[PDB]
Amino acid sequence: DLTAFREHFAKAKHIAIITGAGVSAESGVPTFRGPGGFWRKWQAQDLATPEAFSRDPSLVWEFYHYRREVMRSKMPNPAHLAIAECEARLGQQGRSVVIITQNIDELHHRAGSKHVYEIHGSLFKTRCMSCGEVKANHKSPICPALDGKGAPDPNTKEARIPVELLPRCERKSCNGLLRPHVVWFGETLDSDILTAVERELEKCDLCLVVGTSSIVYPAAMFAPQVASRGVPVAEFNMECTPATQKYHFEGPCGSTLPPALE
């Protein structure tokens, strides 16, 4: 029931919103995972690993280049906006709203969200392999060598780019090789962030799960913290709930969420 939720919503002083791949999906962003989510011959699991980066750094960067470029045509959907505006609106009133997102596309930032935690990092940040500096980067193309590369059709030629022409650290005493600042499979989440997210989720008196379920990573790491405090949790996704069952609003977040937050 929406009414029930809204009664909580109106009372809430510290809302936490966890967002999953669903909300990026409704903006037409490919995640490259599961049925027909392919890039060339590969899926994300095959390429989003440090081993792939070690074995074939050109190929991986081609993949991330493409992904960076396809963001130029994908915009924030109404779910991103409603969240951002909600944040803005509640901040005015001394009520907080934080976003904890698994998504690496910056769509919440482009919707105008401010207190956002990117637990898997971002396509538009680099980390230097030598010195470790994390820098914001939105260049198009990120480096010349990759101009016009990264085509998806399975039959494309590899650009087989020499390693020194892929993006390189600018602090030139260094010149290290850059990688996408994202958490690859088989890597850990940065623990400074998890400690901040912990702190937020404890403060929180309403929790939203959007475009994913609490019964699965990453929402699962935390929703129990919050549910064991008696805090209500509301899921918005396109998963079905059995005939026989805290709050769950089936449908697109684009449709469900903005009415809910108004």
Partner: peptide, 8 residues
């Protein structure tokens, strides 16, 4: 540290 997707 927390393995992404719990290492699945």
């Amino acid at each position: 540290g927390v393995l992404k997707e719990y290492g699945v």
